[PDB]
């Protein structure tokens, strides 16, 4: 079985990672994990290559490689994702607002992400999360929208419906000349 598992895993690695040095690092940290069985260190080391949304399926690809006794902890330490979309209905005329912050848009080359949550607020109460990507506002696709257009679209009606996909990463660009990078929720929240 281990030549079949290796074959299927290798196909997933080649598809999601272009660079050979990044592949070599990936296989090396997995080799180290097999020796030490330190799952926390593994997930921490994996983050160096799993550094953008398109690379997150690697966590799914790696999970079968993880022995049964560590799969619960592995799931806890990795972002919880699902291809099923979550829909919520929010009231803009609420005295305390929506209770969330939002960053991103087409001009940044990234989607729209919830970056802050007010604990006990309206967004929080409906189960929205820091790291959620907004994929739909009032029924509309926002893949071709700038930041301002999305904000204006949210403010069109007295109420707003948001469809959400949990990613667990936040886009970062501290100046107009900086490249777009990604931070895991825990880092972004701690540094804010």
């Amino acid at each position: 079985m281990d030549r079949k598992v290796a074959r299927e895993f290798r196909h997933k690695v080649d598809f999601l990672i272009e660079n050979d040095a990044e592949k070599d690092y990936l296989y090396d940290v997995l080799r180290m994990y097999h020796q030490t069985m330190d799952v926390a260190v593994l997930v921490g080391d994996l983050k160096l290559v799993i550094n953008e949304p398109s690379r997150l399926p690697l966590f799914d690809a790696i999970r079968p490689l993880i022995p049964l006794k560590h799969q619960v902890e592995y799931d806890q330490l990795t972002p919880r994702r699902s291809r099923k979309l979550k829909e919520v209905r929010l009231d803009r005329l609420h005295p305390e607002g929506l209770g969330l912050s939002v960053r991103g848009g087409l001009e940044f080359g990234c989607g729209l992400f919830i970056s802050h949550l007010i604990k006990g607020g309206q967004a929080d109460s409906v189960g929205l999360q820091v790291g959620d990507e907004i994929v739909r506002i009032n029924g509309y696709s926002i893949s071709s929208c700038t930041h301002e257009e999305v904000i204006n679209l949210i403010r069109t009606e007295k109420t707003v419906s948001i469809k959400v996909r949990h990613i667990g990463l936040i886009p970062v660009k501290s100046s107009p000349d900086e490249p777009l990078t990604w931070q895991y929720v825990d880092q972004f929240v701690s540094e804010s």
Partner: protein
């Protein structure tokens, strides 16, 4: 599921102009290149014409000179 033009016009409270624009074979890519005269010629009134044109300009400036990523509090 919705077109770039449909969402663009929806953010401007101008959904009702989507029928006219699609009829004149104008998608968002084409609209970005529309002058005041172009929209005048297809019977777009002054108020709506200036709203569209302003939004095109803001879109172009954001795409060409994107700032730092910042959070909008809602």
């Amino acid at each position: 599921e919705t077109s770039p033009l449909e969402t663009f016009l929806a953010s401007l409270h101008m959904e009702d102009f989507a029928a006219l624009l699609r009829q004149e074979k104008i998608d968002l890519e084409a609209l970005m290149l529309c002058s005041d005269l172009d929209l005048r010629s297809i019977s777009v009134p002054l108020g709506p014409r200036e709203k569209i044109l302003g939004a095109v300009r803001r879109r172009r400036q954001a795409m060409e000179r994107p700032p730092a990523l910042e959070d909008t509090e809602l």
